[PDB]
């Protein structure tokens, strides 16, 4: 009778699996659906800089967010080098293009790599001790060898980021916003997001977001960096929608490998003064924030329920037949 | 013989499932592939505004599309508040930062939240009846309490959006454009997209796109909003490519919850006048259009066909054995 | 005994499949994970243009990359038409809006499609032989009928694109950059990517990228185009991370169908001169580069290993029972 006792145990273990795991845990009675998301970001916070060339400079949201309209990926400026009042003309090329001593060491034209301008074939003086090729281009050339340290916009640590995420589960016609029912105006007036204390506030302090990605804002501010923000919507639509909540994770890794460690870009502000076209060239160091929204909604459906029941019946039958096979041999 | 009759029915029902559903409907004879897509958008249409501060202002595509080069996510401006000729200096801070009565009610420095400038510790007059902290910043401060109603660019309803979607099924080396063979120059000259009448015209009226997402353009224009546009490519590559067509759906939900209901951003136009740097500050209300392109191409392949045949043979055999088991007990 | 010999062969063939394919090839012992990616791009290279209206014009990275901060999708300008010093006023509308002969042929207001301005009801002269509606708008109207050929920025072929891709496998806590251990500073100083010679250099020549997508840079430069760049991370995390490498593919199809073949957009540079607001209107033809990053990391896990073992046991048992069934009938 011991073989018969084993038969029953195996039959029940199989039934316990088929129900508890496949039907209940894995939710085999549910049809699944992905989402389509929209993310809007608003930055708040102010930075002031005191350069030697200029006076106090105010940096508000319109000036330190790239793009201004926002996106899933956006940059907050944390440092910059500015080359003001650049004009198109002839100047000494930056020594990174090459250092010459005579006019014969310059070839007219463009460098094969990282050309700064059209070489005129003339070796002119970059400074009092270095002579470089004369070029036609934006003059004076940018000198970005000294990255400002501490970062010019290191006050961006206290900037607040408001993420407005609108998601739709199109199959189930369910619309959710990360501004969930628990979020009200009083919360939006004072709340700052906290992984455990305030996991639903959609206003994030930038320094907290960088800290939670495992990075140091002081290091990321000087040369730039990347913080990934994931918003996950794992919703069981058999329950009320008020349980369909977003989960926030922050990702990032800054290493001292010193091979392109940070993030920077160059942009220019063009203007006309005294009838001549000028530009301000900025090398902008900043943290790029990538906001990735994924999710999965499940709702009970009859067709998955029957299909799962059929699969469980098949699993149960195969098990019984193989056990009758194994016992025949034993 | 009734048991034998049932045996045959169950055997055939199983065969009917294995062929008709798994092989034919679910297309188990096909290998599947996702796509890689590119979306370009061109807006057309003009808006004119008549502000009290300025004269008639023309708003063409270069000015109301953010970004100008386009993207999967782009904003069309439908309303704005403009603060012209802002300069960096000292002014009264906006009363939203706090209302003071004496110089002692102001602390020099920055507010912890939503700082507008560097407080100087002086309580100056915002208007004839309100006194606020004096700040260093962009002056005069923006006053965006009165959103223009009706929307300044409510004529954007008649703007036309041209979506050019290029998709590739890299596994099958198949390239498709949403400008399908049925779309010609004569169509692009006059066609407007219609869910049923013109489901292939790639020129969309903005108001129609908002209406089809379930929203009201008049409401979305004043404070902004979001419309999701999905392009789906469900193509059976056993047929001619001319049947590989895109399907357009429009998604969106505007609610009167009054907690961040619309969409807005701030951007600045910088300029130099009389040797002093100025900026025009715009608070731009607009509809963000997210274009999501997904799809799936199937082509007959021999390996899925054999694997499906093996799976069907297994299903048929398991069924017969379990039926011989059930009949043994019956 | 021949039937018994077949039984064993089928049993072993089944075991060979269950191990070699399912366990070893398909890696059924591994748990899988997707990635979250961040892409930053830096363009380098210079172009000079010699228009008849202006002098030599220098085009560096800040001016020919849209957006300047970069994105997954970005545009490199390869051609442009410029309408300088546009002001809001009254001018002759472009003849594409319609050609009139009398003032009665113009209706005040806006065109239903592709409106260029507010018609005043007056038929004025566009040129010495064409009369069009007078409009209020940006004047003079852009004339983009003659696309510059050869392309004004056809030197963009030699521009170099640096892709910095940071990916994370969040389930396995593995961070990878496309600047893999084999890439050093000496490589970044001189390397250009090559499908087979230098498959790991993250600096791409634009012309090479277009050639590898199957397109001609000369054709794409005049009217614009699209090149898709895919970065794939198919990593087996049972091995060292130094084997987690990116694979680059380039996608694109340019056809002479002449129905919206290229890519272009319009953007404006606004400025103030002599107390009047002006703008430079650019119609920018360029190649849009879409960078798509996908990947899959597998690491050995005990739960998939046991589940695969159970599936293989089930497959083996079903096979033996059906073979005993087939042999009973034979
Ligand atoms: C004139 O221009 C040249 C070139 O820009 C200047 O020389 C450069 O000066 C910087 C700062 O001292 C040097 O950077 C440092 O170099 C050492 C190695 O020598 C390195 O250990 C440091 O980490 C740092 O990178 C740079 O190498 C040097 N370049 C050359 C070609 O010597 C020069 O100082 C300028 N003169 C004046 C009057 O400003
Ligand atoms: C000087 O500045 C102050 C502050 O901006 C102005 O007071 C504000 O005026 C607006 C318009 O009347 C008020 O908005 C309305 O408030 C009521 C509640 O009182 C609300 O029901 C309406 O929906 C609307 O929001 C605003 O509350 C009020 N602020 C304060 C602090 O009283 C004032 O009118 C300005 N004076 C001049 C001469 O313009
Ligand atoms: C004044 O303006 C009108 C309208 O812009 C100019 O007429 C246009 O001239 C262009 C160039 O010759 C024509 O383009 C060509 O048309 C032929 C067909 O006629 C076509 O085969 C070519 O591929 C090309 O597209 C354009 O059709 C023509 N438009 C009209 C309405 O006739 C005119 O030349 C201008 N006059 C001066 C003095 O510049
Ligand atoms: N598109 C490109 N083509 C060639 N070299 C590039 C390109 N982008 C970056 N580099 C080079 O790669 C190295 C590291 O890149 P990175 O941009 O992070 O440093 P960087 O100092 O900010 O670069 P740079 O000052 O030259 O813009 C630099 O020496 C830079 O010149
Ligand atoms: N990054 C942020 N940090 C703190 N508060 C924010 C942030 N973004 C928005 N808010 C606040 O959230 C509330 C609602 O946001 P929303 O931007 O939709 O309204 P708003 O009136 O346009 O905001 P505002 O005028 O202050 O830019 C506003 O009171 C706004 O001040
Ligand atoms: N949003 C839109 N609404 C209506 N027509 C459009 C729109 N976008 C493009 N078109 C028209 O489609 C045709 C082909 O589009 P495409 O932009 O590629 O050519 P184009 O010459 O650059 O267009 P255009 O010069 O008018 O901007 C053009 O005649 C253009 O006028
Ligand atoms: C960001 O904000 C915090 C909080 O206001 C600042 O921390 C303060 O620093 C000053 C100067 O050291 C101290 O006197 C305060 O006591 C600190 N406050 C707290 C609560 O710790 C911080 O300096 C700010 N920094 C930046 C870069 O913006
Ligand atoms: C968008 O276009 C439609 C169609 O031209 C405009 O509807 C017209 O409105 C005027 C004024 O009420 C009527 O005289 C016309 O008969 C309407 N035409 C049609 C076909 O209904 C509409 O006003 C425009 N609105 C915006 C905001 O652009
Ligand atoms: C891009 O760079 C290549 C390489 O420098 C250029 O090819 C050169 O063209 C000139 C003029 O015909 C020849 O004298 C050189 O011998 C060529 N070099 C090589 C290695 O082939 C090319 O012209 C450049 N073009 C653009 C559009 O930038
Ligand atoms: C960042 O690094 C500096 C040293 O470079 C250290 O003093 C500081 O405390 C760090 N900040 C954090 C948040 O760890
Ligand atoms: C939008 O709402 C207004 C009332 O606020 C209504 O008069 C108008 O008809 C609505 N438009 C549409 C398209 O339903
Ligand atoms: C591009 O096309 C032109 C002809 O239009 C041809 O001369 C040239 O060689 C082509 N370039 C490449 C890279 O094939
Ligand atoms: Mg540098
Ligand atoms: Mg406000
Ligand atoms: Mg045109």
Residue numbers in the entry:
A (entry chain C), B (entry chain A), C (entry chain B): 27 to 356
Question: What does the original paper state about this entry?
Answer:
P2X receptors are a family of seven trimeric non-selective cation channels that are activated by extracellular ATP to play roles in the cardiovascular, neuronal, and immune systems. Like other P2XR subtypes, hP2X1 exhibits a trimeric architecture. Each protomer, described to resemble a breaching dolphin, is composed of a large, hydrophilic extracellular domain (ECD), two transmembrane (TM) spanning alpha helices (the outer TM1 and pore-lining TM2), and intracellular N- and C- termini. Here we report high-resolution cryo-EM structures of the human P2X1 receptor in the apo closed, ATP-bound desensitized, and the high-affinity antagonist NF449-bound inhibited states.
The cryo-EM structure of hP2X1 in the ATP-bound desensitized state at 2.4 Å resolution provides insight into the pore architecture of the desensitized state conformation and reveals subtype-specific interactions in the P2X1 receptor’s orthosteric ATP-binding site. This structure is defined as the desensitized state conformation because ATP is bound in the orthosteric pocket and the pore is uniquely closed. The ATP-bound desensitized state conformation was isolated following purification of hP2X1 without the addition of exogenous ATP, as endogenous ATP released during cell lysis binds to the receptor and remains bound throughout the purification process and structural analysis. However, the result is the same, as the movements in the TMD induce an inward rotation of residue V344 on TM2 of hP2X1 (residue V334 on TM2 of hP2X3) to block the pore and form the constriction gate for the ATP-bound desensitized state. The position of the closed gate in hP2X1 is now 16 Å deep into the plasma membrane, as measured from the beginning of the TM2 helix (residue I328). With the gate deeper into the bilayer and both TMs rotated downward, the TMD architecture of hP2X1 in the ATP-bound desensitized state now resembles a “cone”. In the ATP-bound desensitized state of hP2X1, ATP is coordinated by seven interactions that are conserved amongst all P2XRs: N290, T186, R292, K68, K70, K190, and K309. In the analogous position to P128 in hP2X3, K140 in hP2X1 directly contacts the 2’-hydroxyl on the ribose ring of ATP (2.6 Å). In the ATP-bound desensitized state structure of hP2X1, there is significant density for a metal ion, which is coordinated by the sidechain of D170 (distances of 2.6 Å and 2.9 Å for oxygens on the carboxylic acid sidechain) and to the γ-phosphate of ATP (2.2 Å). Given the coordination, the known modulatory role of Mg2+ on P2X1 function, and the known interactions between Mg2+ and ATP, we chose to model the ion as a Mg2+ and validated it using the CheckMyMetal online server, where Mg2+ appears to be a plausible choice.
